[PDB]
Amino acid sequence: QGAMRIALLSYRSKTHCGGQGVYVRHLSRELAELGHDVEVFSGQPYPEGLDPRVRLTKVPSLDLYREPDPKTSIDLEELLTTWTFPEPKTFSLRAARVLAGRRGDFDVVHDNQCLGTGLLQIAKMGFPLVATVHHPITRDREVERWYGFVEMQKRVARQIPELLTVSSASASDILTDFAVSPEQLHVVPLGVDTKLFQPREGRVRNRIIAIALKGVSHLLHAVARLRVERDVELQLVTKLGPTEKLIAELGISDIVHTSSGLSDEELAALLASAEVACIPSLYEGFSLPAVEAMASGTPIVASRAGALPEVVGPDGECARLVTPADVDELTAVLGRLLDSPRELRRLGDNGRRRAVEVFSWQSVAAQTVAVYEKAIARV
């Protein structure tokens, strides 16, 4: 009962990454809105828009992977400066030093996919420990920084009784790789601000939107072929001559408009102004654009790639599912959906309901508190 004291740990918290910062920013605000007191412990990159009701404690580390630059006065033995990726291992160690000073000041210690050895020391100090695993890094597809730290993560997550993952696709890939118990896992997805992301009663005719491997090339041929029959327009949200010179080759530089660095408000207006959102294999473990499109009442055309059929409702409810590499299938389903005015409304109404029913940040925060209480009950 009362305001729970929660320590939210995140070794990295980039403002725009789906996990790390966005997860930390939205979860902290909603936990504080529920009435609990949240204190976030973060390292570089430090978070940005945290709620004033949320306190931030900087855990400094040598950010040798800084964007401007890739030193004799290093103060801690945790500083490894090993060119032989120790940041998750070192963050959990430095967090154990701060957690020892506040042994009775926190009810739960929640981890944001750090999974370091120092977290096991925090649980040894009496802290109930919960860890959120967004994406199992055991997927060393690029093998065909160095992923030696993931061997430490699987040994830690296997001993944290309450584990949080965002989708069943990430849960199954954790069962296969991390060898974690199934009871150990609690699937709680990511949410969206259903107040900010909502229909706005004005949709431009024949306007598609896509937010960003990335199958954007397949969508670019779709809008290129759709131009002859329809006044199609693509609002592409990504930062980009680069590889996307397809815009020049297809002559679609006029109907394709690129935006980047948009705030959540600017994105919500654009995402609600479009008649359809396309998610072509845009799977970073969890599709925040799909949730943000459903919340806006915008029907989706997505690929059958991982958690997209799970996040998006069944085929024919919130979206139409297509085969990823198939350019022509994507082109036929888009045009047939764009030529149907009754289907754009039905899928959009069902997408708003599901977003409100399933993917609201408040519900995500409420389900997280439930996982918190399970770790408290075992202490």
Curated annotation (Swiss-Prot):
Optimum pH is 8.5. Activity is significantly enhanced in the presence of Mg(2+). InterPro entries: Glyco_trans_1, Glyco_trans_4-like_N. CDD domains: GT4_PimA-like. One of its GO terms (biological process) is lipopolysaccharide biosynthetic process. Disulfide bonds: none annotated. The keyword Glycosyltransferase applies. Keywords: Carbohydrate metabolism, Glycosyltransferase, Transferase. The keyword Repeat does not apply. Changing E292A: Loss of activity. GO terms for molecular function: D-inositol-3-phosphate glycosyltransferase activity. Belongs to the glycosyltransferase group 1 family. Glycosyltransferase 4 subfamily. Glycosyltransferase involved in the biosynthesis of 3-O-methylmannose polysaccharides (MMP), which are intracellular polymethylated polysaccharides implicated in the modulation of fatty acid metabolism in non-tuberculous mycobacteria. Highly specific alpha-(1->4)-mannosyltransferase that can transfer mannose units from GDP-mannose to a wide range of alpha-(1->4) oligomannosides longer than three mannoses, including all hydrolytic products of MmpH. This is MMP alpha-(1->4)-mannosyltransferase. It comes from Mycolicibacterium hassiacum (strain DSM 44199 / CIP 105218 / JCM 12690 / 3849) (Mycobacterium hassiacum).
